[PDB]
Nucleic acid binder design. Structure first.
Ligand code: MG
Ligand code: MG
Length: 346
RNA sequence: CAGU
């Protein structure tokens, strides 16, 4: 891309094949994703985690929360399982950067996975924004990402509500998830990022509510972030729940890819919190709730990172641009692929 | 930059 910026990066053949062929998501991948929301294997994993860590922290409170794509219903059989281990009722505590205690806890847990004959330690990432332990649960073979941060569980619950209220959202996310993998873009643009882009797009079509309109104040807080939401019936908002049909899905996907092919990433951001068209990067910070403003006043270093090629704001952790690591050339690659994909969908 |  960098060598020939003037050339539209060719949509990879693996992607072209799947776009030109949409019945697979509707008839096969959807039922598997729906089944993967609840399977017996997850109970074994949570139980074995409690059994493994209960001795390491004897009197301490302990609770395990599942989240991620398997739980929201856009997973596949190879999908990893994401788990939040809360030791000591830290659910409501927000760490911008992982604290010493948090890193201390992760280090203690690392040893337990190594020594245990039911777990294989795969990786221990301490210096990430969200430190995680990557380990294989050997009885099931399921790869688990273990963290000490509640935010992923909270946005998983929000996706659950959105997908169940408007199933078209779920189908589209399964499709673009697979499209992202066949385009080999997942390392720059994550499945979670594209899910927020789908949600935002459908908000602009008046098929989903702005997240802010679900949070009119009693607030549940993880630090400064409002993590609960009114589970309002879509009828009360006049939001029609569409029947997901292959033509309906195809038309919305076409429009989705067309929209992000022409989106002005230099001046606007994807903003499911606001859920309105043309949210300017230059205006967004003054549009956020009072807790965000109070938090960044005391900590200006924790404001959302807006000076990035691609800005997609987490609807709950409002200081997180989930696409902050996307490069100009990764963005151009994504824009070119959107362009060619919209064409192939007519 | 790494879970989501
Ligand atoms: Mg996952
Ligand atoms: Mg994971």
């Amino acid at each position: 891309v960098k060598a020939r910026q003037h050339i539209t990066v060719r949509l990879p053949k693996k992607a072209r094949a799947m776009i030109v062929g949409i019945t697979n998501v509707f008839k096969d991948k959807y039922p598997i994703a729906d089944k993967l929301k609840v399977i017996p294997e997850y109970d074994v994993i949570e139980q074995d985690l409690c059994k493994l860590l209960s001795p390491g922290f004897p009197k301490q409170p302990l609770r395990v929360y599942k989240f991620g794509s398997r739980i929201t219903g856009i997973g596949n059989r190879s999908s990893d399982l994401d788990l939040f281990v809360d030791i000591g009722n830290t659910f409501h505590t927000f760490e911008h950067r992982a604290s010493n205690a948090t890193v201390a806890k992760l280090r203690a847990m690392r040893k337990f996975f190594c020594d245990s004959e039911d777990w294989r330690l795969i990786n221990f990432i301490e210096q990430a924004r969200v430190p995680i332990i990557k380990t294989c649960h050997l009885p099931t073979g399921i790869e688990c990402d273990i963290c000490l941060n509640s935010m992923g569980f909270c946005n998983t619950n929000l996706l659950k509500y959105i997908f169940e209220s408007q199933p078209l959202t779920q189908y589209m996310c399964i499709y673009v998830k697979n499209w992202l993998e066949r385009c080999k873009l997942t390392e720059q643009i994550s499945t979670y990022s594209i899910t927020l882009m789908v949600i935002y797009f459908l908000q602009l079509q008046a098929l989903l509510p702005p997240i802010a309109m679900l949070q009119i104040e009693q607030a549940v807080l993880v630090g400064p972030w409002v993590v609960n939401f009114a589970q309002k019936s879509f009828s009360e908002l006049g939001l029609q729940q569409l029947k997901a049909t292959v033509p309906v899905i195809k038309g919305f996907l076409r429009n989705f890819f067309a929209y992000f092919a022409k989106f002005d990433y230099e001046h606007f951001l994807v903003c499911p919190y606001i859920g309105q068209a043309n949210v300017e990067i230059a205006k967004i910070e003054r549009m956020l709730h009072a807790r965000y403003s109070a938090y960044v006043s005391d900590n200006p270093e924790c404001s959302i990172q807006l000076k990035k090629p691609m800005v997609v704001q987490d609807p709950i952790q409002l200081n997180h641009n989930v696409t902050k690591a996307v490069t100009k050339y990764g963005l151009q690659t994504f824009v070119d692929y959107c362009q060619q994909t919209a064409e192939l969908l007519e």
